[PDB]
């Protein structure tokens, strides 16, 4: 969020110093300002970089999932009274994108529960305020296999119980990853096939680490059934704080394809324009 | 007035207002950004 230094005045040059030329092999960009090539006047420099930083550029909420549940008798097979999402910021490509503009990042990270909800049908009467339990089951905690088993006592689990209607619910957590950073990018395998061993052991998918790194995120509604089905939508927002990044890479040019760099489709972003054409 | 001057020596008078009348007084490299 630095200023910008000022512009210093230039007038000509006649000397073997050459700005101009340099040598893009050696790896380094030509520091060159406008003063080393062309006259300048005295300009005192009021910009900053305030809106650039790591944590500006982050500091927005940025939806990364849409979950899905019901609100309706358990007899009807159809409807969906549970709904369990992994936690991951790769089910949408905005945020992705922007994450992935670097190799490594460590920030807290706040998310921000944005929930709707409607009715399916109007011949079954109304419905009382719902409340949702949105539960996270780190890796290795119980999934709830029904809406209404044990593993919604949540003893040990953290929940938040959003009353509909109430401003978005919010929550946050600090770095939690178990390296010193999060890598967005793994060049590797979970796990390393030995000699000897069957065509069945040892293969894990390309750059993948953990199968279950940061556990669910699984969401219910708390009331029991009215006569009518209701549809409700929990959208996560999520926000890094405190953001730090390493190893910048070029963005993502095509459309994403799964979870990791896989490319199938739209393989040519360029359009077309003359090579002399303004 | 009077100019002594070295040839020993030698006498020069100007004896006219204008100058005109006066008589004769003999007395790396290779690289560059502009
Ligand atoms: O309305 C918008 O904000 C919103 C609207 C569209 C949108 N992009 S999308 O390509 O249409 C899209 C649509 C749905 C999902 N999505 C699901 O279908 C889902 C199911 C379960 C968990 C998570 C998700 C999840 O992300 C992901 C992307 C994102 C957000
Ligand atoms: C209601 C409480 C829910 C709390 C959820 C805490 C989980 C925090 C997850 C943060 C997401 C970090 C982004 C992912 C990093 C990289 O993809 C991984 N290192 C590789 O999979």
Redesign the pocket.
């Given at each position: 969020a630095n200023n910008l230094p000022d512009t210093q005045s230039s007038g000509p040059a006649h000397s073997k110093e050459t700005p101009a030329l340099t040598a893009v092999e050696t790896g380094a960009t030509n520091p060159l300002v406008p003063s080393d090539t062309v006259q300048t006047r005295h300009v005192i420099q009021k910009r900053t970089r305030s809106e650039s930083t790591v944590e500006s550029f982050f500091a927005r909420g940025a939806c990364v999932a849409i979950i899905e549940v019901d609100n309706d008798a358990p007899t009807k097979r159809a409807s969906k009274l549970f709904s369990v999402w992994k936690?991951?910021?790769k089910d949408t490509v905005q945020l992705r994108r922007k994450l992935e503009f670097f190799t490594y990042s460590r920030f807290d990270?706040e998310?921000t529960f944005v929930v709707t909800s409607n009715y399916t049908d109007a011949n079954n009467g109304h419905a009382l305020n719902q409340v949702y339990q949105?539960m996270?089951i780190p890796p290795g905690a119980p999934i709830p296999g029904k809406w209404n088993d044990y593993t919604w006592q949540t003893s040990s689990n953290?929940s938040?119980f959003y009353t509909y209607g109430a401003p978005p619910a919010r929550?946050s957590?600090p770095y939690?990853?178990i390296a010193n950073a999060?890598?967005?990018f793994?060049d590797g395998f979970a796990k390393v096939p030995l000699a000897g061993q069957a065509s069945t052991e040892g293969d894990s998918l390309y750059g993948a680490?953990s199968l279950n790194?940061?556990?669910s995120?699984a969401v219910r509604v708390v009331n029991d059934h009215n006569p009518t089905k209701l549809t409700s939508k929990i959208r996560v927002y999520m926000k890094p704080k405190h953001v730090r990044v390493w190893c910048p890479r070029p963005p993502r040019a095509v459309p994403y394809y799964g979870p990791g760099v896989d490319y199938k489709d739209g393989l040519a972003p360029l359009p077309e324009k003359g090579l002399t054409t303004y | 007035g009077a100019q002594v001057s070295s040839q020993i020596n030698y006498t020069t008078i100007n004896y006219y207002r204008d100058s005109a009348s006066n008589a004769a007084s003999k007395q790396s490299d290779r690289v560059m950004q502009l």
């Amino acid at each position: 969020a630095n200023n910008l230094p000022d512009t210093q005045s230039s007038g000509p040059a006649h000397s073997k110093e050459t700005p101009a030329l340099t040598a893009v092999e050696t790896g380094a960009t030509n520091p060159l300002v406008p003063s080393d090539t062309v006259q300048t006047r005295h300009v005192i420099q009021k910009r900053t970089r305030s809106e650039s930083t790591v944590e500006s550029f982050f500091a927005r909420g940025a939806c990364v999932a849409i979950i899905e549940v019901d609100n309706d008798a358990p007899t009807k097979r159809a409807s969906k009274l549970f709904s369990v999402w992994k936690i991951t910021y790769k089910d949408t490509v905005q945020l992705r994108r922007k994450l992935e503009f670097f190799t490594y990042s460590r920030f807290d990270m706040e998310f921000t529960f944005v929930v709707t909800s409607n009715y399916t049908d109007a011949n079954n009467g109304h419905a009382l305020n719902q409340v949702y339990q949105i539960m996270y089951i780190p890796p290795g905690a119980p999934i709830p296999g029904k809406w209404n088993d044990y593993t919604w006592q949540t003893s040990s689990n953290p929940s938040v119980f959003y009353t509909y209607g109430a401003p978005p619910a919010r929550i946050s957590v600090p770095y939690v990853g178990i390296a010193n950073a999060y890598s967005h990018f793994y060049d590797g395998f979970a796990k390393v096939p030995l000699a000897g061993q069957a065509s069945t052991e040892g293969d894990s998918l390309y750059g993948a680490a953990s199968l279950n790194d940061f556990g669910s995120l699984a969401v219910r509604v708390v009331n029991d059934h009215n006569p009518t089905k209701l549809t409700s939508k929990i959208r996560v927002y999520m926000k890094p704080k405190h953001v730090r990044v390493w190893c910048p890479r070029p963005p993502r040019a095509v459309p994403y394809y799964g979870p990791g760099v896989d490319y199938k489709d739209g393989l040519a972003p360029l359009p077309e324009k003359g090579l002399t054409t303004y | 007035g009077a100019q002594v001057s070295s040839q020993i020596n030698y006498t020069t008078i100007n004896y006219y207002r204008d100058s005109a009348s006066n008589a004769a007084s003999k007395q790396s490299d290779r690289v560059m950004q502009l």
